[PDB]
Design an enzyme around this catalytic site. Structure first.
Site, PDB file in Angstrom:
ATOM      1  N   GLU B  60     -20.147 -54.703  12.092  1.00  0.00           N
ATOM      2  CA  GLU B  60     -20.993 -54.021  11.073  1.00  0.00           C
ATOM      3  C   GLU B  60     -20.318 -54.115   9.699  1.00  0.00           C
ATOM      4  CD  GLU B 281      -4.511 -10.358   5.855  1.00  0.00           C
ATOM      5  OE1 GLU B 281      -4.155  -9.287   5.320  1.00  0.00           O
ATOM      6  OE2 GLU B 281      -4.859 -10.445   7.050  1.00  0.00           O
TER       7      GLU B 281
HETATM    8  N1  ATP Z   1       4.558   0.385  -5.553  1.00  0.00           N
HETATM    9  C1  ATP Z   1       4.228   1.062  -4.458  1.00  0.00           C
HETATM   10  N2  ATP Z   1       4.651   2.344  -4.330  1.00  0.00           N
HETATM   11  C2  ATP Z   1       4.320   3.021  -3.221  1.00  0.00           C
HETATM   12  N3  ATP Z   1       3.610   2.619  -2.170  1.00  0.00           N
HETATM   13  C3  ATP Z   1       3.206   1.347  -2.328  1.00  0.00           C
HETATM   14  C4  ATP Z   1       3.462   0.524  -3.406  1.00  0.00           C
HETATM   15  N4  ATP Z   1       2.879  -0.720  -3.206  1.00  0.00           N
HETATM   16  C5  ATP Z   1       2.292  -0.631  -2.033  1.00  0.00           C
HETATM   17  N5  ATP Z   1       2.455   0.605  -1.455  1.00  0.00           N
HETATM   18  C6  ATP Z   1       1.961   1.061  -0.164  1.00  0.00           C
HETATM   19  O1  ATP Z   1       1.897  -0.053   0.696  1.00  0.00           O
HETATM   20  C7  ATP Z   1       0.545  -0.245   1.182  1.00  0.00           C
HETATM   21  C8  ATP Z   1       0.264  -1.721   1.296  1.00  0.00           C
HETATM   22  O2  ATP Z   1       1.345  -2.357   2.018  1.00  0.00           O
HETATM   23  P1  ATP Z   1       1.102  -3.844   2.554  1.00  0.00           P
HETATM   24  O3  ATP Z   1       0.185  -4.560   1.621  1.00  0.00           O
HETATM   25  O4  ATP Z   1       2.418  -4.466   2.885  1.00  0.00           O
HETATM   26  O5  ATP Z   1       0.320  -3.534   3.917  1.00  0.00           O
HETATM   27  P2  ATP Z   1      -0.463  -4.488   4.933  1.00  0.00           P
HETATM   28  O6  ATP Z   1      -0.352  -3.923   6.310  1.00  0.00           O
HETATM   29  O7  ATP Z   1      -0.032  -5.893   4.675  1.00  0.00           O
HETATM   30  O8  ATP Z   1      -1.959  -4.282   4.410  1.00  0.00           O
HETATM   31  P3  ATP Z   1      -3.266  -5.222   4.389  1.00  0.00           P
HETATM   32  O9  ATP Z   1      -4.170  -4.671   5.458  1.00  0.00           O
HETATM   33  O10 ATP Z   1      -3.840  -5.072   3.000  1.00  0.00           O
HETATM   34  O11 ATP Z   1      -2.811  -6.632   4.684  1.00  0.00           O
HETATM   35  C9  ATP Z   1      -0.333   0.520   0.192  1.00  0.00           C
HETATM   36  O12 ATP Z   1      -1.536   0.948   0.814  1.00  0.00           O
HETATM   37  C10 ATP Z   1       0.571   1.691  -0.198  1.00  0.00           C
HETATM   38  O13 ATP Z   1       0.498   2.752   0.728  1.00  0.00           O
HETATM   39 MG    MG Z   2      -1.050  -7.335   4.173  1.00  0.00          MG
END
Ligand code: ATP
Ligand code: MG
Ligand code: ATP
Ligand code: ATP
Ligand code: ATP
Ligand code: ATP
Ligand code: ATP
Ligand code: MG
Ligand code: MG
Ligand code: MG
Ligand code: MG
Ligand code: MG
Lengths: 458, 460, 458
Positions: B60, B281
């Site tokens: 072809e 994510e």
């Molecule tokens: N600067 C900060 N000071 C205090 N707590 C914080 C701060 N940054 C993030 N957090 C906390 O960490 C959480 C997010 O943590 P992380 O993103 O590691 O979680 P995850 O389990 O990966 O969440 P996801 O479901 O979004 O993937 C927030 O909801 C908050 O409670």
């Molecule tokens: Mg996360």
């Protein structure tokens, strides 16, 4: 109706003796199902066992390729043809006479035609095949010798043959399948009908090996140790020799720890033990084992332990059984261990898995081997999983390991769930793992609802 | 039956050595499956690894288009012209002679025909096709050369060939598939049969790259311990994680999985060690902000050529593609530890069979190259323990870091616990932790509290 | 292999540059899939962008109907034909020469044939089409110009073309689909193969609009208010500008109340905000809003608020995305609100819904727009729903509203479930709605198991 033994491990029992003598059997199936391997194995065995001269009528394939192909199962058809035991005739009643003549010329009793579907392309018209197919069958039964005709198929769950008329002409119909479920092939054999005799109905799991086709259709009071003294006291003096033990529990409970101590105890009493791993690798197992205080490397040096590491997702359940069997038939262990069954059930059918467990258990009990199989529960309530498990009704002993949260600490608990024809402790004793193995302590007396994994002070 | 090393990443192991010597192998498949590509690769490797004179019979497509098509994989046609190790025959027994002629005109060994289904336009009868197909494979075998006949199919799960008769004539049958489940294609190769030899039954996930086909066929264990980034976490694991080990951090959305992954990668770059972060994510832009908010400069670690971020939306490419990317990305950067954020993002809209085959590959390759893998997964229930047990990828991992929300005094507090630690001692206490601008602060466990695993405990 | 840009929003990225230059692409599909619209759009863009003369070979349709049909997308092919930029040839190698001649006569680079399946009814015999199809392709590539051939299809998930042989002749294959699942159509495009190049595999959601085909293949620390001061204190100083907030809770918890205060706050700071309603009507929303003490009617008068009310069951997810985008591209808001996502997930696929959320979120983040999406939980335990929700892993902030039965009274509770890269209050504070909005009070300290929705005195 007399039946002729084919000396095919399984088929003899599935056909209740073998193939109807003086009649022609049809072995239909798709490409790579093993229609040619069967037909050859039917002839080979016939001359290698009962010494009954046999002729193979070839078509699309040549008498050299067949022999060369038969060399894969360590067979010498040349020596069989050099002794006038077998006759491979290269390739419309000119053939019927050639077969009728050759058969009488070599006093043949077993004939194989692979394949007739090949020499019917110029005919077609459905009814044409039938009339020519019927004539052959009649010309065979008249001669008075039994055969196994080969036929091609399109679908695994469709027409019996290509023209769907060969089944009604033939006396006996054997269908070779190769179903593909979840990107995994499975070879199944079945006897559709056997005119003027009985047979096992439904399909039976088979595999192809160097031995060829492998169709897979006492109770002493002798007690053996598990490696743990406290556990032997809980089982009323250890497990039985001809018994099946089951260690079910959550991930990282200590199933592999108990299997390591169970295998060690074998090698400690100068006894051979085979460990079938499906989760961790030999490298890791050696390290984990040594960390508990067991030199598995030494156990392999004494020729008393053989680790058979493999991935469940690699081969199929049917194949996994052929491995354990062959590996058990070679090493010949006193006790085996499967780590684990949960790794071999993922991406498999509950029906196809139940048959695996029956085989391993049955064979282990048939060869008087103490089998300790483990299983990771899919729930946090071990009891719920054991009850929900259909393989827990087949095991003779059930060792349940359950996580128990106490004082905001994830503690672990062990209990002999059941012990067939033997007294066992009914206490949920706690245990802690260290650098020497399990330390079974006392049972939580001042706690309630411990079966949930989260008890309460009573 | 002697085999023939095709030098195809995977096929060699799937075919238990390769293709049978002086035999005809049929490669059936639909359009875009990669039959021609495979056919070229087979010959290409032959005259670039073992110096094996091979001819490619076209039908072809023309000798220029084919030569131009192989330019996508960086393959030149100097082997077919200047060198004279190849032979592109532009296009019933008039061709068979030329095949044999050219074969002996360069002491041939490898042959490739694409396609044999296209030389049966005049004939509409299946019987005729068999007859001509039968005599072709017969001559070929008589000459004694490895032929890779290529045919086309209509259905992915139907007849082997267009006339469903070529499979019965051929000695070996290879079926290339391209199944579409959930608006996503999946290239799977499978060896149907190999007359007079053994092979791996069932279909194996493969991908097409700039290096051609990438078929993925299905004692170390050192005690050397590595840090996770958190001091208390290292004390909870009995002296940090293991070098060649897989760690999994499961928990409810916003528990601190990404926080733990950030310290795991930071600690790498802190010890002048390369670490690849696979995001699925959040995006680099976002990750950099959150990372910095925790007191970590990921932009710095990228400037030191120690940290790499490979952000990509899970719902785009197939699992096999993601696996090919990680491998290539790991083979380029060659990190000490990698992180997957997350496995739950790649599990959504995928089959448990296709998803379990993924984790096995990543875990296998990670351990095969001595790389500490910290994988995360968002739990689909509020009882983390239930999800971990429900997870069929939680058995595969060596260490399990469970993060779970705990309602205390009408406050949503979080708790951490080392669920399991393979071949190592670990703390069995569910210690509460807090998050701040410095990162995780693992505190003490809950002594006077019951049913903490529920997520809603009771005062003891 | 060089690729020629088609200037089709999406296809450029899906084809990794565009269509292979010097080669012919086949665009197969059923009736109403948009095979003619594509072929026209391929030519138009070619002359309207790179000014590369192009010829369209018509068959069943006439050069007038095509132009009149192209007027729907506000195109003037007459002006393109009046300038000698495009040539529509009305309509067995008499055509190949006519095209070869016309192409060279107008120095054409882009050609479109709609359709070849029409001029093959007198041929048929499957193999006949192939030989004539192959000849055309060869006569095209020889001329050295790139095309997009049109082919008819019967089934959406069946043969590639009508004779299932055109795909093996053509170099590149693009399949236009229009699948009907739940009495709802969905247009999906896919690149089957691209010989001598790379492309995105699988199908991609597209729509048809006045613009034509629409294939759909920073992180600042700037904080913004939500309308509630207590909520800003719970979020550590309000939400982020380039952030996605999610208000999940039981029916009548106050999702729409929080969205109203979120949109108001935009218009209060002289900022534009778009409210996408899918549950209540404008009439009702205006009344409900005013009842809380917010004049939405005034907000529309200041050209700072635009309510886009529509029914989820009406249009498809693919279309809903095109609306938000266009509506966002026109008004250009600072913050948007979707009320709600649960209304757009009912009678839809989890896969087709996940892709919608990715698009809206991605676009909102790409244009630096603060999006507050709400969602009605299907369980009484908000936490269970949030964990069970696959869209909750994509959102940066999660505001959980939970019903709490206290003293035989259905009270309501609010809590900042999570806040990415920002500190938030971890207390389940109670709130009561009045004629001025939300009144976030203290958190239930003397209660246990409040997450169940039915606490207990501690
Ligand atoms: N600067 C900060 N000071 C205090 N707590 C914080 C701060 N940054 C993030 N957090 C906390 O960490 C959480 C997010 O943590 P992380 O993103 O590691 O979680 P995850 O389990 O990966 O969440 P996801 O479901 O979004 O993937 C927030 O909801 C908050 O409670
Ligand atoms: Mg996360
Ligand atoms: N020695 C061996 N070890 C393992 N597997 C083998 C071995 N020999 C053959 N096989 C497997 O068993 C199959 C047996 O093929 P066989 O020639 O019996 O096919 P068939 O059913 O007659 O097919 P056809 O329709 O092409 O005639 C091989 O294709 C291969 O998959
Ligand atoms: N050296 C050690 N000291 C103390 N405890 C250890 C040691 N090695 C392992 N453990 C404990 O043993 C657990 C693992 O036991 P094992 O691997 O036998 O469990 P399993 O249930 O078989 O695991 P899997 O879920 O992987 O199948 C670890 O989680 C840890 O708690
Ligand atoms: N460099 C590349 N990167 C990614 N994908 C590529 C690349 N080159 C080729 N491909 C993919 O592989 C395919 C190669 O097509 P190939 O010629 O192998 O198909 P085929 O199965 O022979 O088709 P036919 O039915 O026309 O014989 C392309 O369509 C594309 O999907
Ligand atoms: N201006 C427009 N606005 C919205 N939808 C439109 C507009 N113009 C066309 N459409 C829609 O897109 C479709 C495009 O039809 P088109 O002529 O491209 O069909 P086709 O795929 O070539 O079909 P056929 O097989 O009949 O040739 C119309 O049938 C209609 O559903
Ligand atoms: N004027 C008011 N005074 C007091 N409470 C009010 C008033 N208007 C509404 N509410 C309360 O607000 C609730 C509705 O809030 P809203 O409509 O925002 O909830 P929702 O969760 O968004 O609703 P839906 O389930 O319809 O999506 C009513 O059930 C009522 O309890
Ligand atoms: Mg055969
Ligand atoms: Mg284990
Ligand atoms: Mg090809
Ligand atoms: Mg049209
Ligand atoms: Mg509402």
């Amino acid at each position: 109706i007399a039946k002729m033994r084919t000396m095919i491990e399984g088929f003899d029992d599935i056909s209740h003796g073998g193939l109807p003598i003086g009649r022609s059997t049809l072995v239909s199936g798709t490409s790579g199902t093993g229609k040619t391997l069967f037909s050859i194995q039917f002839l080979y065995n016939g001359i290698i066992e009962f010494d009954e001269p046999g002729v193979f009528v070839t078509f699309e394939e040549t008498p050299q390729d067949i022999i060369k192909n038969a060399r894969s199962f360590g067979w010498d058809l040349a020596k069989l043809v050099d002794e006038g035991k077998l006759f491979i005739l290269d390739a419309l009643s000119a053939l019927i006479e050639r077969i009728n003549y050759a058969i009488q010329k070599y006093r043949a009793r077993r004939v194989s035609i692979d394949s007739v579907t090949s020499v019917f392309q110029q005919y077609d018209a459905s009814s044409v095949v039938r009339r020519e197919l019927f004539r052959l069958v009649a010309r065979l039964k008249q001669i008075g010798a039994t055969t196994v005709m080969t036929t091609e198929r399109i679908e695994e769950y469709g027409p019996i043959a290509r023209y769907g008329v060969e089944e009604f002409v033939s006396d006996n119909v054997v269908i070779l399948r190769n179903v593909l479920e979840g990107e995994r092939r499975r070879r199944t054999l079945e006897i559709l009908k056997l005119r003027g005799t009985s047979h096992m109905k439904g399909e039976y799991p088979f595999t192809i090996t160097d031995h060829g086709i492998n169709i897979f259709p006492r109770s002493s009071n002798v007690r053996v140790s598990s490696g743990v003294v406290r556990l032997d006291e809980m089982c009323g003096g250890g497990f039985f020799k001809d018994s099946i033990i089951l260690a079910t529990g959550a991930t990282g409970t200590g199933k592999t720890l108990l299997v390591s101590r169970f295998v060690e105890n074998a090698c400690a009493n100068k006894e051979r033990a085979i460990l079938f791993a499906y989760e961790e690798s030999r490298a890791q197992l050696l390290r984990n084992a040594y960390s508990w205080g067991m030199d598995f490397e030494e156990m392999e040096r004494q020729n008393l332990l053989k680790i058979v590491c493999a991935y469940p997702e690699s081969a199929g359940l049917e194949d996994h059984l052929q491995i354990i069997k062959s590996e058990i038939n070679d090493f010949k262990p006193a006790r085996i261990a499967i780590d684990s069954l949960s790794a071999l059930a993922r991406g498999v059918s509950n029906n196809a898995f139940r048959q695996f467990v029956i085989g391993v258990t049955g064979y282990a009990k048939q060869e008087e081997i103490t089998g300790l199989f483990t299983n990771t529960s899919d729930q946090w309530m071990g009891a719920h999983s054991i009850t929900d498990s259909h393989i827990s009704t087949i095991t003779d002993t059930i060792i349940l390991l359950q996580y128990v949260e106490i004082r905001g600490e994830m503690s672990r608990a062990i209990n002999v769930f059941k012990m067939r024809g033997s007294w066992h402790d009914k206490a949920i004793r706690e245990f802690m793992i260290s650098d020497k193995g399990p330390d079974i302590k006392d049972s939580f007396r001042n706690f309630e609802r411990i079966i949930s994994g989260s008890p309460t002070r009573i």
